[PDB]
């Protein structure tokens, strides 16, 4: 197999970002690995969800940034207002 250069033998394993793979007969076989997610609020208004999806809003209020769904788990808000 090959992966950005190095010629991997048929049976050498590797650890990818969130998965680990093994070179099969010409193809890789990958098994998923746990890894967290991140939501970012940068600048005045730059929102990156846990699934990428970058966008800009420019709001003026308190907003539900992220709240647990069951009944009570938690609730993270934020104040995006003109400055």
């Amino acid at each position: 197999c090959r992966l950005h250069g190095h010629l991997y033998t048929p049976g050498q394993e590797i650890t990818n970002d969130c998965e680990q793979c093994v070179c099969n007969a010409g193809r890789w076989v990958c098994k998923d690995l746990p890894c967290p997610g991140t939501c970012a609020l940068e600048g005045g208004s730059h929102i990156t969800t846990f699934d990428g999806k970058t966008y800009t809003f420019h709001g003026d209020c308190y907003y539900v940034l992220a709240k647990g769904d069951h009944n009570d788990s938690y609730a993270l808000l934020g104040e995006l207002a003109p400055c």
């Binding site: 539900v64 609730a75 808000l77």
Partner: protein
């Protein structure tokens, strides 16, 4: 406690009296006859709209 048919699932963390609430259209409305909003368009209860293969219905301020 002042709901507006847009903060129903918000939580009301931080005019219409108890019971009746604002609908975003005008005077206060009951929860059953609360309208729906989609793409900045206000649709009354029982309205029908399709999404590319399906059909929807504004039932109680939500879409079925």
């Amino acid at each position: 406690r002042a709901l507006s048919c847009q903060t129903l699932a918000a939580g009301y963390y931080h005019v219409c009296p108890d019971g009746l609430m604002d609908d975003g259209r005008g005077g206060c409305v009951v929860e059953k006859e609360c309208p729906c909003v989609h793409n900045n368009d206000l649709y009354s209860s029982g309205a029908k709209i399709k999404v590319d293969c399906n059909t929807c219905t504004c039932k109680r301020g939500r879409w079925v």
